[PDB]
Amino acid sequence: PHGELQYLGQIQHILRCGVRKDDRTGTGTLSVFGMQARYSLRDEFPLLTTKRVFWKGVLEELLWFIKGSTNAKELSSKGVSRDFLDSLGFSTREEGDLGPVYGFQWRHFGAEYRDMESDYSGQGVDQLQRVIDTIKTNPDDRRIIMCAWNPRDLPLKALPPCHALCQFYVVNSELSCQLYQRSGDMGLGVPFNIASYALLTYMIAHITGLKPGDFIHTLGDAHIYLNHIEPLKIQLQREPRPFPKLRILRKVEKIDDFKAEDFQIEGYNPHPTIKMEM
Amino acid sequence: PHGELQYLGQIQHILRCGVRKDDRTGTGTLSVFGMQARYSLRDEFPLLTTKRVFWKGVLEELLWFIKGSTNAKELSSKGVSRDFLDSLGFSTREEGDLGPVYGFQWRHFGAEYRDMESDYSGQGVDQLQRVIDTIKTNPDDRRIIMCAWNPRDLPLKALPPCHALCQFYVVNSELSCQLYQRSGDMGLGVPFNIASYALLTYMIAHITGLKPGDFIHTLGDAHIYLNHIEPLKIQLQREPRPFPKLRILRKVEKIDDFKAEDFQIEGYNPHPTIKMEM
């Protein structure tokens, strides 16, 4: 049975049993604490079909994360909040320097930040490379883990908890991935994250000689913004269509060598875009 | 329907679909990656009934964790591996000094370790106190998180990933808890952890004026040791009995003030002990 159905079941469970809870803005949600869904990655790619997901943004953003960029321009230049920017100095924000955030923490966790143009080679902990090495040196490992932080949870001095914990697992030549997200916005964030970590998994599997296995998505505060209820009720009536497939078009050897042109989605036949107001 | 049934369903799923995978010893498991179960804490306490769980050990161990003890004697003195001990010097191991591990990381995360008798008041990050303050200052928070590490994952210099991530959640005057464990031994570790974090939840709820809600237990590598298969097959045939209740016997105000004598289990009618060989 089509895996997208679990996502639609979670939407329905939140509409039915979710409780009113406000977020840091004060804008309301229906909320449920604790959920999990499993999406097979074997011969299919979980890009949701009940609405069009912006695949290109998913790819270009992950690549920008992988590069460790803290330069907003490097991402927008591809064609892809208030409180984070208010922590920045004037000139750094003007030029698009985000400080020590996003993929900086994946590739240079704990490193002294200078500016977005700096050379951080070999500075801090390269969580992504460590994951890939361990898969190679000891696939049975239960600690093949990479964490991500929300930019506003700085500073690292404080030991701020992560936003996401991503665990990889290898058995029978298959790489599986579990993402734990402390909170998930079901209308907008969640579909994008599913595709994003599924793509990461495809990538790591490729360069470690494994086949993709399962993507397991686990949530703490799983929520629907009030203003997304009605568009989601309409999305719930759409029939999922077989997920597409993802193809990597050449043999790639290191995680940093992948390029947007290395990937191609195929057979993606989604229902139309649903605009949901952030 | 009785929540213990989810635990028994997970045992059965692993026996049926689990795959052979070895652990760091090389002793074998059947393994499944990614699972979740929900245990209500409302007017019941999930101490499993299909075998006797050593409640006293669960209590005394959590209290020792809460104290931040790194003194093995402080725990055994109550009546409650090879590789961790081989990292210790001679005299420190002789006297039972475990170094900067277990609840030291809950109450003094990142602090310079000296010895087990040292005064660490106000040193490092008090993750447990921070959780309790945030529940008080902002119950809607999605970052009410506390992490725990396996002792052999030192040193903290390296940014080792956590073993467990524990997230609390508050809605409608109810405190809920989700534990993410990178690996779980279903025969021995898992029942103990369920009770342990359910007890923690009861404790925090008590001193924050809330009612216990749900305990959500999430696993990465969920596994059964080969030598536990047969005793577990027998446990699977036992009918769960209504979970007991937990009673806190006086009004307690700070997390550090709880004592073993403050708690009483009631109505606990378990099937007999099952001895499972570690």
Swiss-Prot record, chains A, B:
Crosslink feature (Glycyl lysine isopeptide (Lys-Gly) (interchain with G-Cter in SUMO2)) location: 254, 259, 275
Superkingdom of the source species: Eukaryota
Keyword Mitochondrion: yes
Keywords: Cytoplasm, Disease variant, Dyskeratosis congenita, Isopeptide bond, Membrane, Methyltransferase, Mitochondrion, Mitochondrion inner membrane, Nucleotide biosynthesis, Nucleus, Phosphoprotein, Transferase, Ubl conjugation
Residues bound to (6R)-5,10-methylene-5,6,7,8-tetrahydrofolate: 185
Disulfide bridges in this chain: none
Enzyme Commission number(s) from the entry: 2.1.1.45
GO biological process, one term: methylation
Major location category of this protein: nucleus
GO cellular component terms attached to this protein's record: cytoplasm; cytosol; mitochondrial inner membrane; mitochondrial matrix; mitochondrion; nucleus
Binding site for dUMP: 24, 142-143, 162-163, 182-185, 193, 223-225
CDD domains for the chain: TS_Pyrimidine_HMase
Gene3D superfamilies the record matches: Thymidylate synthase/dCMP hydroxymethylase domain (3.30.572.10)
Chain positions with Phosphoserine modification: 81
Pathway given in the UniProt record: Pyrimidine metabolism; dTTP biosynthesis
PROSITE patterns the record matches: THYMIDYLATE_SYNTHASE
Listed InterPro entries: Thymidate_synth/dCMP_Mease (IPR045097), Thymidate_synth/dCMP_Mease_dom (IPR023451), Thymidate_synth/dCMP_Mease_sf (IPR036926), Thymidylate_synthase (IPR000398), Thymidylate_synthase_AS (IPR020940)
Matching Pfam families: Thymidylat_synt
Quaternary structure (record): Homodimer.
HAMAP family (UniProt xref): Thymidy_synth_bact
Disease: Dyskeratosis congenita, digenic: A form of dyskeratosis congenita, a rare multisystem disorder caused by defective telomere maintenance. It is characterized by progressive bone marrow failure, and the clinical triad of reticulated skin hyperpigmentation, nail dystrophy, and mucosal leukoplakia. Common but variable features include premature graying, aplastic anemia, low platelets, osteoporosis, pulmonary fibrosis, and liver fibrosis among others. Early mortality is often associated with bone marrow failure, infections, fatal pulmonary complications, or malignancy.
Family affiliation: Belongs to the thymidylate synthase family.
Functional note: Catalyzes the reductive methylation of 2'-deoxyuridine 5'-monophosphate (dUMP) to thymidine 5'-monophosphate (dTMP), using the cosubstrate, 5,10- methylenetetrahydrofolate (CH2H4folate) as a 1-carbon donor and reductant and contributes to the de novo mitochondrial thymidylate biosynthesis pathway.
Protein name as it appears in the record: Thymidylate synthase
Gene transcribed to yield this protein: TYMS
